[PDB]
């Protein structure tokens, strides 16, 4: 069925002076009688106002589509004096059409997203998705095109879908952990006179174990009174696998001992030495330990290639 | 019956970029099939061109109402691939609306009109009627208002109907016979930014007999050889009723004569004297005539009040 009951009013402008959108009509003959038009419905006589006899309807108000895009209305046909219906009323809509006064706009102010450290160039990161208020049905009033406006240890915003990718080969965090990129979107765009919506994106990377652990220095020295019939502990040597977290927690043990325990630890990841067997002898004054400390998992937690796991020597002297 | 098949396109402008006038429609459901719109008719695809799928029709040409105000057109509904009619075609008109680019304009360049000399203030003279090209159906695009722009031994152009009247009491031509007045007409007008059409009008008056006739001078002299056994004629005395034409033609006769005819005349309106009786005598040397000469008709042709009809004396001497 053909639709013909619709009028299109361009929104907001006219400034002052008013614009007709449609003159109505019922056909019929003359013959010494006449039709006077009366209009009723939405914002009747106030927004849209009718010149009676003719059928002329100008808008006498700024129209905002985003407020309300359609206005179901009902105008009439009666004689002037008779007022008897010279045509039973019709229902019909008036539409706007939306002009690009409405901006591109992001839902949250800043955004924060994470991505696995060293991973092949172009790895998915997140979608940023703005929003234009306008008409997504006609023209380029809304069609948006995203772009990385800045963020140059590099990611790519894939322009159609806005999805962020990385733009960089590997990306060893130990260099830089957090990343700032500023995001755009053009109304039309591909065409200037476009609109401009920006957002902050805090990008951080995760970890991997691309680090063996460290020892403060290669040769340690300590000292001790010769029995302590309690415990006890003597010294602390440290590892620092820069690769944080679980990827940092390292395992100590000694590989010139046996009078000495060595202890965990999730304390700072040291490093402590208890005296196991008590003590007795001058027979020794000097003692020696070599100590392996290494990162962990339940399957190979060095899935790359790691060289040292820092050994190192401890010299304990007697008193 | 309600009319809804009509669209309104404002004429001539857009300059470049195009303006939609109406998106079409047939209702129906989706369900994995679709409507593609094809348009055909007047200046189809060339003046008015169709965005197929949507129903959008912008004009891609200056439109001139005065060239053609309406365009009967026929657009369609078929599927894209199927091309089978998803709706039997509709006939509908597109209308313009006319904007005031068209000027007020008079049919002939100059105009020439006549009116009876002394006649009560405000006597009808003629209609001047211009012509605006525009729309006489909507707004003040055409409603015209005439004015005497100049012509100040005065006439009035009655502004609604343009009819010229005299603006002056009596108006004795003998003062001035022809009159120049320049005529105007404003498009809208009563409202500036109106349009401006001017015309020349040569006004002349007719006559009445508001003049007695004249004699060159009050005393005439002539002379004559004493017999002429032929005719003959002697002298000519003149009248000049300034009131021209029939109102000037005057009647001579003598009211010390009898040897002398006096003759008409539509010669210059004199004035001639024939000798009736021949001649004989020294017995007279000096002769005398008094002469009435007067304007004419078959009922009172001095329907005002006229004093002299200039008498006057002629002295003929003998030789
Ligand atoms: Ca708006
Ligand atoms: Ca808008
Ligand atoms: Ca917009
Ligand atoms: Ca790492
Ligand atoms: Ca590590
Ligand atoms: Ca790392
Ligand atoms: Ca025109
Ligand atoms: Ca025009
Ligand atoms: Ca005009
Ligand atoms: Ca006269
Ligand atoms: Ca006269
Ligand atoms: Ca006269």
UniProtKB/Swiss-Prot annotation, chains A, B:
Single biological process term from Gene Ontology: synaptic transmission, glutamatergic
Please report any disulfide bonds recorded for this protein chain, giving both cysteine positions.
none
Superkingdom per UniProt = Eukaryota
Which subcellular locations apply to this protein?
Answer: Cell membrane
Keywords from UniProt, A to Z, are: Calcium, Cell adhesion, Cell membrane, Cleavage on pair of basic residues, Glycoprotein, Membrane, Metal-binding, Phosphoprotein, Repeat, Signal, Transmembrane, Transmembrane helix
Specify the Cadherin domain's residue ranges.
2-106, 107-215, 216-319
The name this protein goes by in its record: Cadherin-8
Q: Which organism is it from?
A: Mus musculus
Q: What is the lineage of its organism?
A: Eukaryota, Metazoa, Chordata, Craniata, Vertebrata
Q: Which gene encodes it?
A: Cdh8
Q: Which residues of the full protein are shown?
A: 63 to 383 of 799
